[PDB]
């Protein structure tokens, strides 16, 4: 019966989406003309794209007509595009009636929200182009992605493109503090700041981690430890230990540090992420940074294929140790 706070606390109406000025303006002037063109929202995750398109849907439609006359699909379906083509064809052929008691009639078209549209290959995008140019008047599409360049030219030409910029950390901390005051959980400003930092500008992940920490802690204060282990983030002490083992030049203590990291349940992709963030923002030479980052990309690709954490981490740490001891 309760709903997650991501769904509960998204803005109900357009112009309640903060830090988006021009996108809200064109969506307002589309609401005034009551005609929604083909939309393409691109920006970082957790920046208000789904919130903005859903707010436009709820304010163009009725509260009871909003969920019936829109269809949110995920474009990364593993059964090709033809299954998604079947859903769009069925939803375009299926028609429902609409009547609002507020005195404004419903628009004749319908809204199809295709999320992660950038994950579709160019053949699938060209296949979808036929559907959207064959159901142009009776169906309008909104493609939600993060990279406009992944969307092919026939799609991006006929869509209206909007870019969503991420909120600053002060605004995210303010919204999280408002959420915590609304939901009655004891948490200082430092924990909220660490939550916003550990989410890396992702307000969706920040709200998810805050709600999960409130559920886990059982009415106590939200410490830094629960936020750290609820985000899967390795503490900086282990990262410094990894770098000290690499700089020492002893492979046995390198194996000990890696096996200690494996025994603590920490992921290897997270360690590769932290190691990359440490390496690319320090005083290493350009050759050292280049070799280390190339090995980091190779190890990340190998881990994505399903390779064992221990062997890939040992190989990457051997490469980093050799590159750091090359100056010795």
């Amino acid at each position: 019966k309760p709903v997650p706070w991501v769904e509960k606390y998204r803005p109900k109406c357009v112009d309640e989406v903060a830090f988006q000025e021009e996108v809200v303006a064109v969506l307002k002037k589309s609401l005034e003309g009551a005609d929604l063109p083909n939309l393409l929202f691109y920006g970082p995750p957790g920046t208000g794209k789904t919130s903005t398109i859903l707010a436009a849907a709820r304010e163009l439609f009725g509260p009871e007509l909003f969920r019936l006359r829109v269809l949110e699909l995920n474009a990364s379906d593993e059964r090709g595009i033809q299954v998604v083509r079947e859903k769009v064809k069925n939803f375009a052929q299926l028609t429902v009636s609409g009547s609002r008691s507020d005195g404004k009639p419903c628009p004749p078209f319908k809204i199809v929200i295709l999320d992660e549209a950038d994950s579709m290959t160019s053949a699938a995008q060209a296949a979808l182009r036929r559907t959207m140019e064959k159901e142009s008047k009776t169906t309008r599409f909104c493609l939600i992605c993060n990279y406009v360049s992944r969307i092919i030219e026939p799609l991006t030409s006929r869509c209206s493109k909007f870019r969503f910029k991420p909120l600053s950390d002060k605004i995210q901390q303010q919204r999280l503090l408002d959420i915590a005051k609304k939901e009655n959980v004891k948490i200082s400003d430092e924990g909220i700041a660490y939550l916003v930092k550990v989410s890396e500008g992702d307000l969706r992940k920040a709200i998810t981690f805050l709600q999960s920490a409130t559920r886990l802690t059982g009415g106590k204060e939200i410490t830094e430890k629960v936020i750290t282990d609820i985000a899967g983030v390795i503490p900086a002490e282990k990262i410094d230990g990894v770098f000290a083992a690499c700089q020492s030049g002893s492979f046995d203590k390198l194996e000990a540090v890696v096996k200690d990291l494996i025994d603590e349940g920490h992921a290897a992709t997270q360690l590769v992420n932290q190691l990359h963030d440490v390496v690319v923002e320090n005083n290493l030479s350009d050759k050292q940074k280049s070799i280390i980052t190339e090995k980091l990309a190779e190890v990340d690709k190998c881990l994505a294929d399903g390779a064992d954490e221990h062997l890939q981490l040992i190989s990457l740490c051997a490469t980093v140790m050799q590159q750091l001891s090359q100056n010795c």
């Binding site: 379906d77 059982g218 985000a231 899967g232 992709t269 294929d305």
Partner: protein
């Protein structure tokens, strides 16, 4: 049953270690908004014990009343695959990676069915039925996308607990929808305390030195430490301070394999190690574990600067082993290339 299956805790207050984590898991179910869990960590850390504790705290005691069902599912290529499922009156448990590349298939229909089961069954106890997906880290990308779709579709009617050992293969879309439960391995003192607690219930008094040896030689594996304690109880009635811990049979087989690799570097010895790795693979030992043990004992017998090259070679051929359908080819590729490198290294 054994002490790994009889003295296993069933309540969340009976978990000896991770008391703060067990308390947080106890207050997790009190809100009533129990989400999908992602319980990950090393092997035998206490993962499945904690899932059974949470399942007992969620429903009644009837989750312990277990049975086994078999389901036949039709693939879209018009073929039928039969899989096994641990089940009770309130929960489900399946290893979906048992269907190969068709895991997505047993991912979809099975949860669809259990959703309909919760649509049919009414008991006014809990709104959802929890299904335990074992080895989610062995699922393919299509399987994990189908899992994302199924969790987003049937969230209201059923809940999911993903038990894995590696979240690296688990896609970031899955990790962004389930609460992460990291269960690190118990320490040496924790394993010794649990071993003494279990051994006291049998009327036996093991010493602290034997418990410390069992904790050290188990590599922070509580299940392996308890089972080695079972083997020591089988071997002798009194627990001497110098009691020999029985080593694993395939582990000493892999040790002998690596000494065979190091001792002679010839095509005949390469074919002998070929036969040894075939006989290891016929025992259903996973090739990742074989590669890890082989690499560990080769790094035992390696030099200082050769350790990094051998480790990078082993990681390379383990990734190729995960890529290829016949893991034996990449195993012998690693063995032959290591033999060539070793023969080159000892020649000067």
């Amino acid at each position: 049953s054994l002490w790994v299956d009889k003295y296993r805790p069933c309540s969340l207050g009976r978990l000896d270690y991770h008391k703060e984590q067990a308390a947080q898991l106890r207050n997790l179910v009190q809100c009533g908004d129990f989400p999908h869990l992602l319980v990950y960590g090393p092997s035998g850390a206490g993962k499945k014990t904690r899932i059974m504790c949470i399942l007992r705290e969620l429903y009644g005691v009837g989750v312990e009343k277990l049975r086994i069902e078999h389901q036949t599912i039709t693939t879209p290529s018009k073929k039928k695959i039969e899989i096994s499922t641990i089940a009770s009156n309130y929960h489900l448990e399946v290893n979906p990676s048992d269907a190969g590349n068709s895991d997505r298939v047993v991912i979809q229909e099975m949860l669809k069915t259990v959703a309909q089961s919760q649509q049919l069954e009414t008991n006014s106890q809990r709104d959802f039925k929890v299904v335990l997906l074992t080895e989610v880290d062995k699922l393919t990308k299509d399987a994990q996308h189908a899992l994302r779709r199924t969790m987003e579709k049937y969230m209201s009617t059923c809940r999911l607990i993903l038990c894995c050992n590696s979240t690296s293969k688990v896609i970031p879309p899955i990790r962004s929808r389930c609460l992460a439960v990291r269960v690190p391995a118990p320490s040496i003192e924790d394993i010794c305390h649990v071993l003494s607690t279990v051994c006291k219930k049998e009327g036996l008094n093991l010493p602290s030195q034997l418990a410390h040896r069992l904790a050290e030689k188990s590599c922070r594996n509580l299940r392996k430490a308890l089972l080695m304690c079972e083997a020591c109880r089988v071997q002798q009635y009194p627990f001497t301070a110098d009691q020999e811990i029985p080593e694993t049979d395939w582990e000493v087989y892999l040790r002998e394999t690596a000494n065979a690799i190091v001792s002679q570097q010839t095509p005949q010895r390469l074919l002998e190690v070929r036969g040894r790795l075939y006989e290891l693979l016929t025992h259903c030992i996973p090739p990742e574990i074989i590669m890890k043990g082989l690499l560990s004992e080769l790094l035992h017998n390696c030099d200082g600067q050769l350790k990094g090259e051998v480790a990078q070679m082993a990681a390379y051929y383990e990734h190729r082993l995960q890529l290829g359908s016949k893991a034996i080819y990449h195993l012998e590729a690693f063995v032959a290339k290591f033999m060539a490198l070793y023969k080159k290294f000892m020649e000067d």
